[PDB]
Design a protein around this ligand. Structure first.
Ligand code: SF4
Ligand code: SF4
Lengths: 783, 783
């Protein structure tokens, strides 16, 4: 067609109303499209009304005829003549009588020459064909400003109508490709005596030729070749800018050496890639034997290239970054390094769990089985992580271990949690995170224990002390009516730990006391979830285990107690005592979190069950290991729903790795959650500036972070400077607001400022997808 | 204990560093807590360091001794003496030698009297015991300013240390409850000669007594009772403010008349409730016979009251709204009307699907069965919704019907979608919403049809025209090798519709052509999903149907095709042709969306299957009807997982109705999605300002909105003024940024600015919970 050319050239004008006579089919005010209802009188009406409504914000109005209306035959010239004398904002008719002819012709006949420019320097130039795609003209404007050259008119870029009306007084037309306006260049040449130069501004060499030719012709026009001023000035600028851009490109040269690319202007991108040291080789199997590292078909064939599981780069009208000039090609190299050196590609090209050979699956299962002994063999004395050397701590993210002990006792059904008004503070915090009632009756010892067990008739009593066995045996002695009720006694050794240490200690105490050994029940697995798992994650873990045909006994089960559910002074909803007792007959023990390793071993030496450990269930490889271990335990193949979900997560990772790449993130959480989220973010391409841990835990030095320290949330604001994302609890809204970081991901406990924190599922393929999309949208909204 | 009183009184001071010697257990700079590591030398070190670091932002430092340290016996007076001479920011020791004694005593001995006030008017007063809880002092400060009285010191409110050091020069102490500082009031009385008045500022009557007594005593102190100025001024202000507050309370009086409340200061809240016309009557069955409408136990017994399925109100230190003064009690009435007149309570107190009698379930199933005939019997000629009277449309949210036809053809496996370069625009938009390849090859007719069917070997061809049967029978005639391949021909009648009309038309065309009638297969249900459902919703619908033991045949199935999945020029992943053919033997037909009703009837008269219709699957009652219909079709009871999820959704609705209440929302979507979201938001308590629909659809006038019109996204910015939330597609980021609305919920198509839009599940109990939490967090972040 023809109106498509006139559209793509004239619609980019940003201070004009574009009226499109006819249907939507076939079809900052530049973002206001104006379409007439399904007609020359109606177009008269629309012209009048749009002029009156958008007066003061519009400087002109373009009336485009479309395929449909041209068939109707309504003469847009007639309505222009019959309507312009009423509203005086200039109306330009674009009629049917190379689509870029029509554009150049209407532009000369009606737009160019209607206003003498306000400021006409000694070096005005007109750039014809610059669409300012993601600021490619913006990378060249400072160079032209430094050179002393004036851009009087940029056609189809940040083009104001007034700027376009000045093109009559200039000396050089530069056609930045978009050649088909060569007719306009030739026609302004005859009438207005303006030489035209067809230049490309993509690449060092082509930019050099462009600037040299421009300096030459403007030296002819202004002054003479003799006394060349522009030639010397361009030589000087060229030298300095080339030096600076080589110096800035060297780091990216080092990272992008020896990589192989397939290319499917063509030359400009070629030589740019060759400069960066990328060998251009030139259909799945031909790629397999090609082993390409990059696909630079910048075409709209994207989605195919993305699904080929290879890094892909796009050089077209759809790019969202400037590639023109020295800064533009620095950006080009940066985006290349982002998309090619991303950590996701080796993970994505790894073998799926269902296509691994039996030997590899056996090795992975063996690693999962040895996780517990690996954590226990690590001893913290050799840790290089820094002990906090402060004296006064401010903003302490270190919660009390009694909070974790309460969280674990809350997952057991009909539990009386006893602490021995100073206990209130635990109740309010846990309630506010969970928006749920919690029972923490606190405490003569035997008398009170009697009192409670009669009043509430519990089937288990949870006693936690920091810093008595005879007293408990005394209570049992004085009254054997209550002998049946078990008492679980948990101790945290230094009142120097957080929620995680208390949770681990009380879970270990439960594991050592309640379960009884017996004959192994096939299909039964004991799951010891970590404190970093929300109730939704525990429910999802149960569902994943049940999909494999296994019976999950989860100790503790906060997924039904401290989750939204709809009265006794005991805790209800958790795992019953019969289930905890029969959990000692399970075939295997699974724990999610390093801190629980000891607890798992507490079972291993008591009965002999194998223990399988997983640091995290977020990230493709970690969920893959979990599924492999579950398939090995159950003896069944992996269900196909999980195969579909893995494919979905792969697609999401490919599509969202552009927002995570080379972003600065500071994470301040407790040990296990910190490990999980730091590993996930580092595997998705983020640069972790600081890793702030609540307490000294195992494996902190191996985290993929620049700075790892044990600290509070004031060290957060001391170290999160320059970060694009902050991951922490709600208390982190301190350090963000101070540092101006608008991206804060709420994780861990407490999270009291947002609703649904305990219902956030970040486990498995769908949970990883949810976390991925949440973080990607945080990056999108704050940029 | 005692340090708890000194803490609750002295810790609110906002410009002082609070150093707490000892453990965290038992324990705007006011939000900086400073705790010493697990010690008088160490406290010396901490004092020095905290003074040097936070210098310029701190005016003093409080060193509190705790239960633990007092047992250690380290004399905080000794460290104060040994450290104050080094850093001169005043250090105040709070030691052990009614917890409010200690507070008043340290305050007099060290804080009060250290600085003459800068500006001491003729009416300074000291308010003792005002904690500025959510701004209760803030509602009284303008009244005191208008009266000409100066608040020289507010103890424990927005209390700056300098403000506290001035209390030595004043005439009246007013104890705003918090009595236990009466010792401080008596002790300032002896030394500084300042009368103390115990007043309450909660309620019209008590505020009146307070202001009268204050005017009297300050008239004694300043001037004489004779020439009373303050008495006359308070009379004047009292009259005007009482009139204004009665006038503002009348609307809330009308809405809160005859309601019954149970109350579990006590008097002040009583009389306030009685003023508002609420009868105070004074344990589930005693409530059943009490039929209470409101529970005003403002205690921390909240969670129990919330779970009693009754409106609950809280009057304590945890309230997040000011209740003092006339404005404070206007706020009280507003919050009462919000929590009592919410639409969620009648829905929440309705019978669950598993506890309904068989007759009620039969009636609900009959309504679901008659949905289709109800929609078809409605004819649009009588609709009161306004036809758009404009001539030029700007920001057209009306997508082309070819977009919907493409969306439906994309859900069929091995489909060649033919339209007869003008077709590109559909491909880019659908791809950008779905980030997935789409195939829309467009078109001598028989020659081209031959060409394609050989090249791509499809099993179905989709032809869509707007505004030939012999030509199709010609292609079949000329070449019977391709006779088997079915051709589906869809027509939208006026090129005056949106995605929804095209989707419905092509689904109706598929239903009339492909399915074949046969013998009814029990357990098979044909699901016709609406265009407003994302692929995740289609997958969840399939899972809900499969949990009941039913086989869902979903036409079309975009959940596997245009969802993240990992090449042919045809569309893959959708529903195969054998399944669509055998869908004509289903026991029942379910359609989600009014626009699909016709399609359902297209089956009903072709074979005879019953059709069940559901406008939306968001909201407790709608999902309840869906589950009842599914249970009736399958003949099985409702699975218990869904019972747990219903309980979770109920809890979430109770907990989140405070953020949705009386909020202003403007929704601009297509018909079915608009109905769904408008009904959900209106049922959760929001005030829908404007309902902007893309096209004229059935049942638009019955929507719970103030203004319903068919319009574009410019009418959105014309009508969304004053709205707290905007629901629309990504193009809505226009009208929000113009109007300053920072809360924009992305719904419908296209959604190109955020990742994971097509993976958003808003169906069923968990989907309703997800939508609820997303909207609640949007309201929380932008307020
Ligand atoms: S309808 Fe016409 S003007 Fe519109 S895109 Fe197609 S051939 Fe071109
Ligand atoms: S430990 Fe002591 S000061 Fe702390 S809350 Fe308990 S009794 Fe009070």
């Amino acid at each position: 067609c023809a109106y498509d050319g006139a559209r793509v050239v004239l619609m980019p004008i940003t201070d004009v109303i574009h009226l499109v006579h006819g249907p939507i089919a076939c079809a900052q005010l530049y973002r206001r499209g104006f379409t007439t209802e399904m007609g020359e009188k109606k177009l008269y009406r629309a012209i009048l009304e749009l002029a009156e409504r958008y007066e003061g914000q519009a400087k002109a109005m373009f009336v485009y005829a479309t395929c449909v209306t041209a068939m109707t035959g309504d003469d847009v010239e007639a309505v222009c003549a019959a309507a312009g004398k009423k509203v005086a904002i200039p109306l330009i008719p674009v009629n049917t009588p190379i689509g870029n002819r029509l554009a150049g012709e209407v532009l000369f006949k009606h737009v160019i020459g209607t206003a003498e420019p306000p400021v006409l320097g000694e070096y005005p130039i007109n750039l014809i064909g610059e669409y300012n795609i993601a600021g490619d003209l913006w990378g060249m404007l400072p160079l032209f400003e430094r050179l002393g050259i004036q851009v009087l008119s940029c056609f189809s870029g940040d083009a104001t109508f007034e700027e376009l009306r000045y093109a009559h007084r200039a000396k050089l037309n530069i056609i930045i490709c978009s050649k088909s306006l060569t007719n306009l260049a030739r026609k302004m040449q005859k009438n207005y005596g303006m030489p035209y130069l067809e230049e490309s501004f993509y690449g060092m060499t082509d930019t050099a030729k462009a600037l040299r030719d421009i300096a030459r012709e403007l030296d002819d026009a202004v002054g003479g070749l003799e006394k060349r001023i522009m030639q010397d000035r361009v030589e000087k600028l060229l030298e300095e800018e080339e030096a600076t851009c080589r110096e800035r490109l060297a780091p990216y040269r080092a990272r992008l050496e020896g990589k192989r690319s397939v290319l499917f202007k063509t030359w400009s991108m070629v030589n740019a890639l060759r400069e960066l040291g990328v060998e251009i080789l030139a259909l799945l199997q031909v790629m397999y034997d090609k082993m390409p590292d990059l696909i630079v078909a910048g075409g709209k064939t994207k989605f195919l290239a993305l699904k080929t599981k290879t890094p892909f780069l796009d050089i077209n009208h759809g790019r969202s970054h400037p590639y023109a000039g020295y800064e533009g090609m620095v950006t080009f190299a940066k985006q290349l390094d982002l998309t090619v050196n991303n950590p996701i590609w080796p993970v994505l090209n790894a073998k799926a769990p269902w296509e691994k050979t039996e030997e590899e699956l056996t090795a992975a299962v063996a690693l999962a089985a040895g996780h517990a002994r690996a954590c226990l063999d690590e001893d913290l004395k050799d840790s290089t992580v820094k002990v906090p050397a402060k004296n006064a701590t401010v903003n302490p993210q270190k919660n009390s271990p009694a909070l974790g002990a309460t969280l674990a006792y809350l997952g057991i059904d009909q539990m009386l949690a006893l602490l021995h008004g100073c206990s209130t503070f635990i109740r309010l915090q846990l309630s506010r995170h969970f928006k749920e009632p919690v029972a923490l009756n606190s405490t003569n010892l035997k008398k009170g224990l009697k009192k409670v067990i009669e009043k509430f008739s519990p089937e288990v009593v949870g006693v936690m002390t920091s810093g008595v066995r005879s007293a408990i045996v005394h209570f049992r002695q004085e009254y054997p009516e209550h002998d049946g009720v078990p008492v679980v006694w948990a101790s945290t050794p230094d009142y120097c730990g957080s929620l995680q240490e208390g949770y681990a200690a009380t879970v270990e105490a439960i594991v050592r006391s309640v379960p009884e050994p017996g004959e192994t029940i096939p299909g039964q697995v004991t799951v010891l979830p970590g404190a970093h798992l929300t109730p939704a994650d525990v429910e999802e873990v149960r569902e994943l285990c049940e999909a494999f045909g296994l019976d999950p006994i989860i100790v503790p089960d906060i997924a039904n107690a401290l989750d939204g559910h709809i009265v006794s002074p005991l805790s209800t909803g958790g795992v019953s005592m019969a289930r905890i007792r029969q959990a000692g007959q399970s075939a295997a023990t699974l724990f999610i979190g390093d801190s629980l390793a000891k607890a798992a071993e507490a079972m291993t030496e008591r009965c002999g069950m194998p223990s399988y450990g997983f640091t995290s269930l977020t990230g493709l490889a970690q969920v893959d290991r979990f599924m492999e271990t579950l398939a090995a335990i159950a003896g069944r193949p992996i269900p196909e729903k999980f195969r579909r979900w893995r494919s979905r997560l792969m697609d999401a990772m490919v599509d969202s790795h552009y927002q995570f790449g080379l972003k600065k993130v500071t994470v301040a959480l407790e040990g296990d959650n910190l490990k999980t989220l730091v590993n996930f973010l580092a595997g998705m391409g983020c640069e972790i500036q600081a890793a702030i841990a609540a307490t000294r835990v195992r494996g902190l030095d191996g985290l993929p972070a620049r700075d790892i320290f044990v600290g509070d949330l004031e060290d957060l604001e001391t170290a999160a400077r320059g970060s694009d994302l902050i991951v922490a609890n709600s208390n982190g809204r301190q350090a963000a607001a101070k540092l101006g970081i608008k991206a804060h991901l709420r994780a861990g406990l407490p999270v009291f400022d947002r609703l649904g924190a305990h219902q956030k599922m970040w486990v498995g393929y769908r949970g990883t997808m949810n976390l991925l999309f949440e973080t990607a949208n945080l990056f999108q909204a704050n940029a």
